[PDB]
């Protein structure tokens, strides 16, 4: 039904507008496995991530047809939806590159 086109290691943060603080998505510090999933029937994409130790879902966010994906640093990327700002702090420069090009691909095919 739906395919994982990439798997990077990153710390998923969401932004706390109230306090100008980046907070760990899910409330708990640590790395997660972050996927970009492709629903082959619908041609729709979403970012899904489960923390490495707990297998708790810390992020599950649709990728819309025009998402502005900002690569702030070579290891920190961020994008915005109607509610939050999501950040991925990747474990490696390479993790970020493959995730970034899967994201850039997903936006071209949407």
């Amino acid at each position: 039904s739906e395919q994982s086109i990439c798997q990077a290691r990153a710390a998923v943060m969401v932004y706390d507008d109230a306090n100008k603080k980046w907070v760990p998505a899910g409330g708990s510090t640590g790395f997660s496995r972050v996927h970009i999933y492709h629903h082959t029937g619908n041609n729709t994409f979403r970012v899904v991530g489960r923390k490495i130790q707990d297998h708790q879902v810390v992020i599950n966010c649709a990728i819309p047809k025009g998402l502005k994906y900002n690569q702030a640093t070579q290891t920190f990327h961020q994008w915005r939806d109607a509610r939050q700002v999501y950040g991925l702090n990747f474990g490696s420069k390479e993790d970020a590159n493959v995730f970034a090009s899967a994201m850039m691909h997903a936006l071209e095919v949407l």
């Binding site: 739906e2 999933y37 629903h39 979403r46 879902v57 649709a62």
Partner: peptide, 6 residues
């Protein structure tokens, strides 16, 4: 595995 797509 991924959650239901909500």
């Amino acid at each position: 595995w991924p959650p239901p797509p909500t």
